[PDB]
Amino acid sequence: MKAIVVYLSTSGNTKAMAEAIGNGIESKNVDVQVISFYDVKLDELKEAEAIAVGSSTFYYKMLLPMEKFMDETLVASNPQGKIGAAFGSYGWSGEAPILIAEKMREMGMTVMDPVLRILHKPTDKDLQECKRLGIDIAEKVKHK
Numbered sequence: 001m002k003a004i005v006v007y008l009s010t011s012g013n014t015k016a017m018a019e020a021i022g023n024g025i026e027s028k029n030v031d032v033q034v035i036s037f038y039d040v041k042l043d044e045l046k047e048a049e050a051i052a053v054g055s056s057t058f059y060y061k062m063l064l065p066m067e068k069f070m071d072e073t074l075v076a077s078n079p080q081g082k083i084g085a086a087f088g089s090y091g092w093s094g095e096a097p098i099l100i101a102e103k104m105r106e107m108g109m110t111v112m113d114p115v116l117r118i119l120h121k122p123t124d125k126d127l128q129e130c131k132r133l134g135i136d137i138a139e140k141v142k143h144k
């Protein structure tokens with residue numbers, strides 16, 4: 001089975017989170033690809049049993065390219081009933097991962113806890129939190 005970790009990142013912080021989530025999924029022998037939203041194909045979303053989506057927060061929102069990706073591409077992938085996860089890096093208000101999770105639920109996805117947001121640059125211990133989210137995603141995939 002297969003998971004995909006899709007992200008938007010402006011300075012690398014959400015990207016670092018995404019790669020650590022993927023490392024956690026790999027560690028449980030679930031296939032995974034960690035990929036920027038710009039490069040992901042519709043078929044790759046359709047193929048996946050679990051889709052984790054991450055964005056940083058700019059002016060209290062996920063950035064517009066990610067909002068479009070979610071409203072157009074993710075909806076078109078027919079994700080009803082799939083495992084979802086939401087994450088991102090932020091500086092003080094941190095709305096984007098909350099908004100991502102809400103969008104996923106509206107789409108019919110079952111969003112795992114925790115929705116994971118991390119201030120500024122992830123420390124090593126922060127990246128262990130990310131790895132744990134990936135382990136949890138893999139275990140959820142294998143349980144289904």
Ligand SMILES: Cc1cc2nc3c(=O)[nH]c(=O)nc-3n(C[C@H](O)[C@H](O)[C@H](O)COP(=O)(O)O)c2cc1C
Pocket residue numbers: 008009010011012013014015055056057058059060061089090091092093094095119120121
């Ligand atoms: C122009 C700009 C606007 C930002 N606005 C917010 C904001 O409204 N709320 C917040 O929590 N962080 C805000 N941030 C902080 C970023 O979310 C934070 O630096 C984050 O670590 C960037 O992660 P990334 O490298 O994955 O893009 C802003 C940063 C910039 C540069």
